[PDB]
Every structure is written in C-alpha cells, then in structure tokens.
C-alpha cells in the first residue's frame, strides 16, 4: 500500500485499495453547530491521564506518534458517550502548509491550523488490533489547534522533532504529560465514525472538543519541517496530512453542552 497525501496517492485515491473509504460512517466530518443537538443523556467525560507512561516518538511517514504504555489502565478515557474503559495508546497530529488549513474535522466549514488525536481502545476487546474490528473499538479525542500564543506543554514534543525528521525515525520520549495538551473546557461534540487514514476502519467514537488550544507560529512551523520521505530520499515536507470532510449520511452529531 502506498497511500499518502500527494496529488497522486492522496485521499481521493484511497478508495481503490480501501473501498470502505466511501462507506456509511467515514471521518472526518463537518460539524454543523446549528444542527448538532445537545444531548442531556451524555454523562460527564472523564479524562484520567495522571498515571500516563509515554515511551517513544515515531515518524511513520504519515504523521508522528507519541506512544504510551498501554499494558495496564494507566491513562484512560471514560464517560461521555462511552460505555466502559478506553486506554490511551498514542497521540498524533494532522496539520497544514499554512495556518488556514490542517484540521480534519471542521466547525461550520472552518478549518483550524491543526488537529490533535488522542487515540484510545476499548479494554473489553483485549488488544488494539481486536478493537479496530469493532464498531465501538476505539475512542479518539480530537482537539483543534489555532495559531496564537505558544502552548508550553507542547514544546517538549516540538523540540524532539529534529531527531525524528524522516520516515522510520524514532526517539525515546519518556515522562511526557499529555494533560498539558488539553484545553480548559471539556465541552464536546460526539458522533460515530472511522479512522481518518487507511485502513479507514469504521471503529471510532469521535469526541471532538469545542475549545481549541493555541499554539505558536514557531511551534507549528517546526511540525512543517518534518519529512514524509525516509533518510536520504528526496525531501517531501510533511504538510497537509489531513483528510477532508466526508459525507455525514445517516448520522447525528450530539453536543455535550447547551
Ligand atoms: Zn489522526
């Protein structure tokens, strides 16, 4: 498989190797704020990251993953629309070539500079590989980024990127606290969807926070210095690694807030 985000291997081609690309619950989507309905039955969302154990950072040629030890319930997501316990496995980002694009979800068609995905799996399925085969297998916590003030809790991430410039490179990345990437509010929209990259599995409950985090222009600039290619190949800057919004179809987006 040779999918990516260029003119020749990008989102509009993915459906050929991954036919679920055109399925019934694909992500990302546009969140119409005037159609999404406050759902008083959602419980409060619970983000328990106090015991999180980050291990490593990886450039996989599509994005970078900060990886976590998920061999126990150390960092978990519960509540909101979720039944049971979802364990944090990794986080990553999608971003643009300019500040006016980069996010995958959009809010009333507005694109943010980037989007953070904190990826969790449902413990009830025992491992991640099994969970991605289940309609309620994953829970991804989506956070928009906008350019403004710098986010201090992002800077360690920013600073390790020199060392994972190219595809395949990894660095040790211990004692990173993902709580520093959260906004103040946990108000959210939620809907059933998919992974936003191949294999585009329809296994995700999306929880997208309403309040974006601010990062600096200098911070986001350093994301754009990364490379899609591997070491000693011609340089393709890692930019615009985002899938555009997909048809909503027979789905409702529910809001946690009035
Ligand atoms: Zn993502």
Swiss-Prot record:
What organism does the UniProt record list as the source?
Homo sapiens (Human)
Note the effect listed for residue 60 to H: Reduced proton transfer
Q: Where does Zn(2+) bind?
A: 92, 94, 117
The protein's name: Carbonic anhydrase 2
Disease entry from the Swiss-Prot or TrEMBL record: Osteopetrosis, autosomal recessive 3: A rare genetic disease characterized by abnormally dense bone, due to defective resorption of immature bone. Osteopetrosis occurs in two forms: a severe autosomal recessive form occurring in utero, infancy, or childhood, and a benign autosomal dominant form occurring in adolescence or adulthood. Recessive osteopetrosis commonly manifests in early infancy with macrocephaly, feeding difficulties, evolving blindness and deafness, bone marrow failure, severe anemia, and hepatosplenomegaly.
Q: Which InterPro entries match?
A: CA_dom, CA_dom_sf, Carbonic_anhydrase_a-class, Carbonic_anhydrase_a-class_CS
Location of site Involved in the binding of some activators, including histamine and L-histidine? 90
Q: Which Gene3D superfamilies match?
A: Alpha carbonic anhydrase
UniProt effect for mutating residue 140 to H:
Impaired activity
Q: What is the effect of changing residue 62 to A?
A: Reduced CO(2) hydrase activity, rescued by 4-methylimidazole (4-MI). Reduced proton transfer. Enhanced proton transfer. Enhanced proton transfer capacity
């Amino acid at each position: 498989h040779h999918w990516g985000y260029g003119k020749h291997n990008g989102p509009e081609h993915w459906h050929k190797d991954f036919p679920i690309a055109k399925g019934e619950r694909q992500s990302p989507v546009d969140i119409d704020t005037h159609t999404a309905k406050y759902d008083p039955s959602l419980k409060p969302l619970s983000v328990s990251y106090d015991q999180a154990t980050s291990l490593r950072i990886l450039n996989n040629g599509h994005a970078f993953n900060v990886e976590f030890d998920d061999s126990q319930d150390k960092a978990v997501l519960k509540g909101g629309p979720l039944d049971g316990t979802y364990r944090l496995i990794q986080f990553h980002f999608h971003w643009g070539s300019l500040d006016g694009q980069g996010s995958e979800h959009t809010v009333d068609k507005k694109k943010y500079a980037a989007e953070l995905h904190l990826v969790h799996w449902n413990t009830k399925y025992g491992d991640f590989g099994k969970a991605v085969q289940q309609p309620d297998g994953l829970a991804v916590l989506g956070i928009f980024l906008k350019v403004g003030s710098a986010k201090p809790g992002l800077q360690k991430v920013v600073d390790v990127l020199d060392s994972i410039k190219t595809k395949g490179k990894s660095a040790d990345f211990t004692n990173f606290d993902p709580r520093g990437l959260l906004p103040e509010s946990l108000d959210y929209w939620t809907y059933p969807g998919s992974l936003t990259t191949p294999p585009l599995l329809e296994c995700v409950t999306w929880i997208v926070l309403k309040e974006p985090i601010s990062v600096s222009s200098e911070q986001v600039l350093k994301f754009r210095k990364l490379n899609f290619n591997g070491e000693g190949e011609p340089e393709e800057l890692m930019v615009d690694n985002w899938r555009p919004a997909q048809p909503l179809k027979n789905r409702q987006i529910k809001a946690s807030f009035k």
